[PDB]
From Swiss-Prot, chains A, B:
Identification of the protein by name: Transient receptor potential cation channel subfamily M member 7
Function description: Bifunctional protein that combines an ion channel with an intrinsic kinase domain, enabling it to modulate cellular functions either by conducting ions through the pore or by phosphorylating downstream proteins via its kinase domain. The channel is highly permeable to divalent cations, specifically calcium (Ca2+), magnesium (Mg2+) and zinc (Zn2+) and mediates their influx.
Membrane side Extracellular: residue ranges: 18-19, 61-63
Biological source species: Mus musculus
Intramembrane region positions: 20-60
Disruption outcome: Inactivation of Trpm7 in mice results in early embryonic death (6.5-7.5 days). Mice die as a result of trophoblast defects and consequent failure of implantation. Tissue-specific null mutants shown defects in cardiac and renal morphogenesis, organismal Zn(2+), Mg(2+), and Ca(2+) homeostasis and thrombopoiesis.
Annotated family: In the C-terminal section; belongs to the protein kinase superfamily. Alpha-type protein kinase family. ALPK subfamily.
Location(s), subcellular: Cell membrane; Cytoplasmic vesicle membrane
Residues of the full protein shown: 1007 to 1098 of 1863
Length: 92, 92
């Protein structure tokens, strides 16, 4: 579950923030939002940053249409497979 | 689950509100948000009160960078261990 997290946070932070110099904030932002997604926080109005209801309208740019596809795969893996595999683990 | 709650709400309220005189509001605020976290309310824009998207920008101060680490441990214990232990309880 920690690897699926980094498989998602690093492409997302890279596609949505292309103009970043090296910073310790890059170690938070690859791990912060993808972790809070495991607990039901979808960040609904940050998905599709080019939408009109977006709360990140300045992040709209080339390639950012990829991130909602990425997060759809991410939560399917984490919530629909990995959290329920862990329920199944505990039950058995 | 009520003890993991107080293990989190008391360090959080202490780190984020250092300048408090004794008040009955201290018995609510150690128990209120940590309980609503069990039911999927992450308080996403109150985590990391020093962030730019924060809805508590005045709470930013010394030591407040500890609280997102604390809440990451908190929900892991409550949701990933304790809620699913309780599912496992009921199934068996
Ligand atoms: C057995 C358990 C052991 C733990 C194992 C796991 C290891 C956990 C390791 C995680 C790596 C975190 C590294 C922090 C990066 C530097 C932070 C920094 O510079 O300042 C930040 C620190 O202040 C905060 O408030 C944020 C602290 C991070 C919260 C982590 C919660 C998510 C849990 C994740 C769990 C999933 C882990 C998935 C696998 C990796 C603040 O903001 P900034 O912008 O970064 O800098 C300041 C600038 N500013 C003032 C403009 C805002
Ligand atoms: C079930 C329902 C689906 C029905 C079926 C038919 C599919 C329909 C698809 C049709 C493809 C055409 C869509 C784009 C329209 C034209 C260009 C355009 O407006 O681009 C937009 C984005 O979109 C893109 O840039 C491209 C998006 C392509 C993703 C398509 C997924 C393929 C199907 C499924 C893949 C799943 C996996 C497949 C394996 C099974 C531009 O808008 P923006 O992003 O807001 O940015 C603009 C602002 N900017 C200029 C600042 C950047
Ligand atoms: C079998 C079941 C039995 C129950 C067992 C559990 C014990 C339950 C007991 C919990 C302790 C409650 C102590 C209340 C403190 C005093 C509050 C007060 O005076 O006013 C508040 C009451 O109005 C509210 O809105 C808060 C009421 C608390 C709701 C509980 C929610 C969390 C669930 C709890 C469950 C988790 C417990 C985890 C374990 C501890 C309002 O605001 P204030 O600021 O406080 O005062 C007014 C000032 N102001 C106008 C400026 C706002
Ligand atoms: C997977 C990804 C991680 C990659 C690995 C490398 C780790 C990277 C970390 C590197 C450490 C350096 C980060 C801070 C940068 C310099 C100072 C700074 O800006 O501080 C910031 C906060 O942060 C702190 O004050 C310190 C944060 C330290 C905790 C880092 C986690 C340790 C590893 C994991 C721990 C898990 C458990 C470990 C056991 C397994 C200040 O910013 P702010 O908070 O916004 O407040 C500023 C405003 N104010 C002045 C009003 C207050
Ligand atoms: C699932 C199976 C495959 C099916 C998918 C079929 C292919 C999908 C369909 C179409 C392909 C992508 C093109 C459509 C959208 C283009 C419109 C556009 O400009 O968009 C953006 C740029 O976007 C780009 O420049 C995209 C470049 C290619 C991305 C890499 C391929 C991704 C496929 C992933 C496949 C993963 C498969 C994983 C395998 C398991 C917006 O650009 P702009 O801002 O408007 O430009 C002006 C910028 N300026 C102002 C700064 C100058
Ligand atoms: C997990 C395993 C161990 C690894 C831990 C890694 C250690 C982490 C690394 C380094 C230590 C922490 C400090 C680094 C950041 C300092 C930057 C800073 O100033 O931050 C803040 C202050 O914060 C402080 O002053 C905090 C001082 C130490 C806190 C106690 C240790 C926390 C580690 C717990 C470990 C738990 C272990 C649990 C064991 C299971 C912000 O200050 P400021 O607002 O900028 O100052 C101006 C304020 N003024 C304007 C009011 C004057
Ligand atoms: C197998 C796993 C693959 C993924 C991963 O774990 C192992 O690989 C690690 C390598 C890390 C980076 C190393 C170097 C730096 C440079 C630093 O530069 C300070 C500049 C300035 C501050 O302003 C100093 O004053 C900022 C942090 C950064 C980019 C790291 C980020 C986290 C990364 C990507 C980690 C990530 C979780
Ligand atoms: C084993 C467990 C450890 C944790 C815990 O349970 C047992 O320990 C309890 C002790 C409680 C405090 C006792 C005294 C007061 C003073 C009062 O002062 C009124 C001032 C003014 C109003 O403005 C009057 O006019 C405010 C409340 C406060 C701080 C209590 C808060 C809750 C606490 C921390 C409880 C907490 C849940
Ligand atoms: Ca939820």
């Amino acid at each position: 579950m920690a690897l699926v997290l980094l498989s998602f946070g690093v492409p997302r932070k890279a596609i949505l923030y292309p103009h970043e110099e090296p910073s310790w904030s890059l170690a938070k932002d690859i791990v912060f939002h993808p972790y809070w997604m495991i607990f039901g926080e979808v960040y609904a109005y940050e998905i599709d940053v080019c939408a009109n209801d977006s709360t990140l309208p300045t992040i709209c740019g080339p390639g950012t249409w990829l991130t909602p596809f990425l997060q759809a795969v991410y939560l399917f893996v984490q919530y629909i497979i990995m959290v329920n595999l862990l329920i199944a683990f505990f039950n058995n």
